[PDB]
Assembly symmetry: C3
Homo-oligomer: 115 residues x 3
């Protein structure tokens, strides 16, 4: 569902990947759960460069899977961590967890349609 998922991106991806598509949804969830775990760890440690790195990785994985609002927040975190501006990091991690839970349920529902 828009505006959380850009059907543009995912319609093309499903068409190419065929039975790999359900594996990409499952993998996206696992890889994003590990990214969020890494961001919380980086936030507690006050590790700006780890926040920036992981944010940038997450931005790309989000964009690959048409999770465009999630990739937006990842970009914000990457750019502010790059400035050393960390005030917003807790609230952006929160925004990422609330947006990621939408994408996760949408992916778990779409996954159910496949064997």
């Amino acid at each position: 569902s828009a505006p959380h998922l850009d059907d543009r991106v995912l319609a093309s991806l499903q068409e190419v990947m065929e039975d790999e598509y359900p594996v990409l949804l499952d993998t996206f969830v696992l890889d994003s759960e590990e990214r969020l775990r890494s961001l919380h760890a980086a936030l507690q440690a006050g590790d700006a460069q780890a926040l920036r790195h992981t944010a940038h990785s997450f931005k790309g994985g989000s964009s690959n899977m048409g999770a465009v609002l999630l990739a937006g927040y990842c970009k914000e975190l990457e750019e502010s961590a790059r400035r050393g501006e960390l005030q917003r990091a807790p609230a952006l991690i929160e925004q990422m967890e609330r947006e990621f839970a939408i994408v996760r349920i949408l992916f778990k529902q779409e996954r159910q349609r496949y064997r």
Copy 2:
């Protein structure tokens, strides 16, 4: 306290239930905690059916105990779940956690008035 609790639902329940009333405050809290744990488990499984049927009971339990804002969220989650419109489920669950925490402390305050 309005708008969280409808004092006239509760005043009627007090008058009817007499000595049972404090026991109902206590079991509303434990029952609702369990219903929230089951909604989280249902959301992490992507089980729209388990979301729908836990939301509908919590709606009634909330209604029964004059928690009318909490009941209005449960109603929204039940309907969402029945339709399969899961994009709102994470946000509605969090709204039901923040509104239940209000009801919980009001009911713990009220329970202190009884042996």
Copy 3:
């Protein structure tokens, strides 16, 4: 920094404290975390007087370290708890967790500037 930290309260404190300044950043984090844990335990017990007493301490400790928005939420909790008005307690505790998370990462950033 602003509006979360009043930099001049802190500029005066580091001028006075010199070498002890980084210890105070560390201490403030640990003191504040234990007081949040105390607030949550008081909220789950429906203990208005524990909420009021811990809220008052935290207001002072926040104020001493230029965390003026955090101290504002603590003041709101102290005043409402004294009046036995506990309907806003859950929300105010959550506002103090989100604001504290900002002060925490800014203090962990600054602490890395010292041995």
